Structure formats: C-alpha cells, structure tokens
Amino acid sequence: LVYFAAXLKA
Amino acid sequence: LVYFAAXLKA
Amino acid sequence: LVYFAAXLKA
Amino acid sequence: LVYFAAXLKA
Ligand SMILES: [Cl-]
Ligand SMILES: [Cl-]
Ligand SMILES: [Cl-]
Ligand SMILES: [Cl-]
Numbered sequence A, B, C, D: 001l002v003y004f005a006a007x008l009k010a
Helices: none
Strands: A002-004 B002-004 C002-004 D002-004
Touching: none
Parallel strands: none
Antiparallel strands: A002 B002, C002 D002
C-alpha cells in the first residue's frame, strides 16, 4: 500500500 | 488517508 | 483495489 | 483501511 496521511506498507 | 495499491478516506 | 474502511477501485 | 489488490492500515 502506498499512503499519505503529514508520508509504503504494498 | 490517501491510498493506492491497481485506487481517499484523511 | 478491494477495500473496506463504514465499503472496488483493482 | 482494509485492502487487497495479489494483501490493514483502519
Ligand atoms: Cl490490482
Ligand atoms: Cl495500475
Ligand atoms: Cl465501487
Ligand atoms: Cl472498478
């Protein structure tokens, strides 16, 4: 999973 | 939360 | 992407 | 966020 919430888990 | 893994909830 | 966070983007 | 797209962040 690529995510941003202020920065990979994919 | 913005998230992509292939598509906001933040 | 299949996701649930409360419901396809894949 | 729960997500599968082939595997929690919620
Ligand atoms: Cl996909
Ligand atoms: Cl794609
Ligand atoms: Cl949908
Ligand atoms: Cl779709």
